[PDB]
Amino acid sequence: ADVPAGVQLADKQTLVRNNGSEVQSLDPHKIEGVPESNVSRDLFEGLLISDVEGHPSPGVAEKWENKDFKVWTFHLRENAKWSDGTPVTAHDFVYSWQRLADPNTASPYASYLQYGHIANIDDIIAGKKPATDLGVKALDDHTFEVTLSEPVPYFYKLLVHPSVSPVPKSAVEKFGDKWTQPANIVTNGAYKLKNWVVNERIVLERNPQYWDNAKTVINQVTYLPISSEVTDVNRYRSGEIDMTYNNMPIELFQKLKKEIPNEVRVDPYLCTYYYEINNQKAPFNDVRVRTALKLALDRDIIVNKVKNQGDLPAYSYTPPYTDGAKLVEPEWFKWSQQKRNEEAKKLLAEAGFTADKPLTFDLLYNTSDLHKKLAIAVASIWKKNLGVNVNLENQEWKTFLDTRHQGTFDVARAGWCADYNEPTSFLNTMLSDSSNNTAHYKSPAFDKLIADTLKVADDTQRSELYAKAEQQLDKDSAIVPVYYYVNARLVKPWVGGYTGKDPLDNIYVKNLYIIKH
């Protein structure tokens, strides 16, 4: 943390953050959500990290070079260490990126190595080549070299993501899936794991072997798993919680803006809220049904009337303000809701649905005050505007993600937040073979469009190809875009170092500090 001159620090440097839910795992190759990555950033550090404003900056790698955007060489700081005091080396990374690539690890983020185009990854994931053929090598203990199959000018931007963080092979090999227990785990970020009580708390303590330890200020941070946004706000205001999770309750937000305006942080965020349709399950495999659901939803009502917390009505998957996004707003989005509804009804009537045999399906969401209130409103709007019946169902976070990966669900409450600020952090996830493709969408036309983006060596042709990829997605009604999130949360006045300038919200507790209060 960089504590400004003249700030007085509290004697006790501890922090309590709400983290939305119980994490799927603390293993960097088994995780894919925000709550998981919030904890992962404090425990495991990759080649690069985001600075306090989000810019890609030195992580274990103090400096790097590239040749033709295809061969990337990372020079690892000599004092990078794990929590047991042993050196962090380039072989840790080799081992780690191979384990991510290996089908037997079954990482939800296996395809991140496809997104960076590391050599031989397609064959590895397909089981045609062993993981040991991946295009990574340790040239020595402090030098990690990555070879891509084509030029990727933004490659280093990917490397702050938890899936490319190192894992300690000895712990992994000796303890299997219990390697992340506190008595076994070994970590290289600013914190170590002190305690983990499922559905109660995760407590982290300063890791004194961290290379940048001298600048770390918070000695302990607790992450909680409260999925009720009302409860999170209540335990913030009672004094227990210093930073809520960044999901705000419909019940209390407007009041909060008026009672504690300086604690209510609202900043740009590269995330989209949408209803993920299971594209492979009838009747959702019919474009007519998907398009009707997409068009009959009334974004104005949801976004400005029922939520009203600053979100923007969405007509795409990639947020329009992603760096490199130059999206074309579909014509359906400028129609009146009235014209949207008629088109929707016409389409379902064409799909074989009638008053007598209406369309009925499930809307699956993760236990939450906010998502339940929004699902209820969506249900009513769909009932009213289109005559479809929806059954609401809530699932705890971890189970919910497994349900979507299993793909027999109907529709699910989804959100995707950028992992790197470039349109393919979103677009790559709808590739037919992406491990992140829970929409279960498979379009050869879509795949081609994206594959072509690295075949050109021009940003304009790339941006136009991302624009067309979003038009293919929309044409197919792969999803139901709802809104583009704003990052809204409560932060106590004594929490210093949280700028809100990072549109990916990659916070590191090593950058924060408690002001004397």
From Swiss-Prot:
One of its GO terms (molecular function) is peptide transmembrane transporter activity. Disruption phenotype: Mutant cannot take up cell wall peptides. Induction: Part of the opp operon, which is constitutively expressed. The keyword Protein transport applies. It holds the Pfam family SBP_bac_5. One of its GO terms (biological process) is protein transport. Keywords: Disulfide bond, Peptide transport, Periplasm, Protein transport, Signal, Transport. InterPro entries: Peptide/Ni-bd, SBP_5, SBP_5_CS, SBP_5_dom. Its main location: periplasm. Belongs to the bacterial solute-binding protein 5 family. Accommodates the ligand side chains in large hydrated pockets which impose little specificity on binding. Tight binding is achieved by utilising the hydrogen-bonding potential of the main chain of the ligand. PANTHER family: PERIPLASMIC BINDING COMPONENT OF ABC TRANSPORTER, PERIPLASMIC OLIGOPEPTIDE-BINDING PROTEIN-RELATED. The complex is composed of two ATP-binding proteins (OppD and OppF), two transmembrane proteins (OppB and OppC) and a solute-binding protein (OppA). This is Periplasmic oligopeptide-binding protein OppA. It comes from Salmonella typhimurium (strain LT2 / SGSC1412 / ATCC 700720). The lineage of its organism: Bacteria, Pseudomonadati, Pseudomonadota, Gammaproteobacteria, Enterobacterales.
